[PDB]
């Protein structure tokens, strides 16, 4: 296996995580490594 990614408070304000990651109960499969996890919004 398991792992964590950790982000700073001011960075999280600037980022948009994909729903499958921010709301894990909705996920039904693996996320692909190297695929998008969060994008900058500002």
């Amino acid at each position: 296996x398991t792992h964590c990614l950790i982000f700073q408070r001011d960075a999280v304000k600037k980022l948009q995580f994909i729903p499958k990651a921010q709301y894990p109960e909705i996920a039904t499969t693996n996320l692909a490594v190297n695929s998008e996890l969060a994008k900058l919004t500002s």
């Binding site: 894990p24 692909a32 490594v33």
Partner: protein, 381 residues
């Protein structure tokens, strides 16, 4: 150079309290079905520590068995985990929990599982010919249609660009076919296999997924230190990042107060390497010794979500604070970086997949690029 299983035997027998726990953690497993059998249901449950040591010694020269070939319908959560299968129910007892929290026990377990890792990366399978490591995988069922399809299907489930065959997905040695199990020379090379070029393209986004993994938790506004033992397991940065034992990481703990923690699970049939989630300069890297088979009370017998048939699956947030793990902290406020401050990556072992292997490109002072392979889990301690 003593047999690490023999060192473990002596630890148990030469300490009165561990001797007591090593009996009680088995006595506390109910005799009644389903617990007369291990969680796979394929074998009788082990009921004493001497049979346990005997089996552990035997496993030092075995690769995990793909038992789903001849038994496709039994519980499959412990595929790849022969040690985990033996101690799963003991893990769930009060005495078992105390036993697997003991630091001397976990040093002995580390040495046992690292000795196992030596065999799993040995292409001779401890002296059985130059193709021994490969043949052991075929003998263990890993080239069966069932295993290969499970690996192919698991890799395809995360992408729309699906491939028909294993060789279109994962790198393996030359002239690899299913019949020769892709000419993988040992378990370790199959376990840490890489994706073929372009099968996992690096997205444009500022953060990409570090692991081929199943989302588990996303917590916001986390604390410096928290009561990670209470129901729900609030994350405790101070404990998770090892500020307990390394004052050097304390400033990063403080810098993550109020930040967010995202956690995801890597299945046995998933890609097990680590890729860089961001571009930046490594400012801190550590390895942290800890537990292997420690799970929550809630995951044990009589627990509100126990006994876990595949501990520590339902204790994943808990073990981030005590299991064998590693820490990587990347500074993205650098040229070519996304300018989102410090990003932490905490791979956390589970059971006998607890070897945290940082690649040399992650040394402190170096710059990693988003999507680079930076390490891997291995079977081992």
């Amino acid at each position: 150079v003593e047999n690490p299983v023999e060192t473990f035997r002596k630890l148990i027998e030469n300490d009165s309290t561990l001797y007591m726990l090593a009996h009680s953690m088995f006595d506390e497993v109910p005799e009644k079905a389903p617990y007369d059998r291990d969680p796979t249901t394929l074998k009788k449950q082990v009921r004493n520590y001497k049979t346990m040591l005997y089996l552990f010694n035997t496993l030092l020269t075995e690769v995990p068995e793909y038992f789903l070939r001849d038994n496709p319908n039994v519980p499959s959560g412990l595929i790849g985990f022969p040690f985990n299968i033996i101690v799963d129910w003991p893990m769930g007892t009060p005495s078992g929990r105390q036993f697997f929290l003991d630091t001397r026990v976990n040093k002995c377990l580390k040495d046992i599982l690292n000795k196992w890792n030596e065999f799993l990366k040995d292409p001779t399978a401890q002296g059985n010919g130059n193709k021994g490591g490969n043949q052991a995988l075929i003998d263990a069922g890993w080239s069966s249609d069932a295993a290969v399809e499970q690996l192919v299907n698991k890799a395809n489930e995360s992408t729309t660009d699906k491939k028909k065959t294993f060789s279109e997905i994962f790198q393996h040695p030359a002239n690899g076919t299913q019949e020769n199990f892709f000419n993988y020379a040992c378990w370790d090379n199959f376990f840490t296999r890489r994706f073929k070029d372009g099968v996992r393209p690096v997205a444009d986004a500022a953060v990409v997924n570090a692991c081929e993994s199943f989302p588990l938790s996303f917590d916001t506004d986390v604390s410096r230190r928290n009561t990670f033992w209470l129901k729900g397991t609030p994350y405790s940065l101070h404990d998770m990042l090892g500020a307990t034992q390394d004052e050097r990481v304390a400033s990063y703990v403080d810098g993550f107060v109020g930040g967010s923690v995202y956690q995801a699970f890597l299945s046995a049939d998933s890609y097990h390497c680590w890729n860089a989630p961001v571009t930046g300069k490594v400012v801190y890297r550590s390895l942290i010794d800890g537990t292997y088979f420690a799970e929550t009370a809630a995951a044990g017998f009589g627990g509100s979500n126990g006994p876990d048939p595949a501990g520590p699956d339902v204790s994943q947030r808990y073990i981030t604070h005590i299991a064998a793990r590693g820490v990587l902290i990347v500074d993205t406020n650098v040229t070519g970086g996304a300018k989102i401050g410090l990003v932490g990556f905490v791979p956390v072992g589970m059971s006998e997949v607890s070897t945290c292997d940082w690649f040399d490109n992650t040394e402190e002072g170096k710059t990693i690029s988003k999507g680079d392979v930076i390490g891997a889990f291995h079977s081992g301690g």
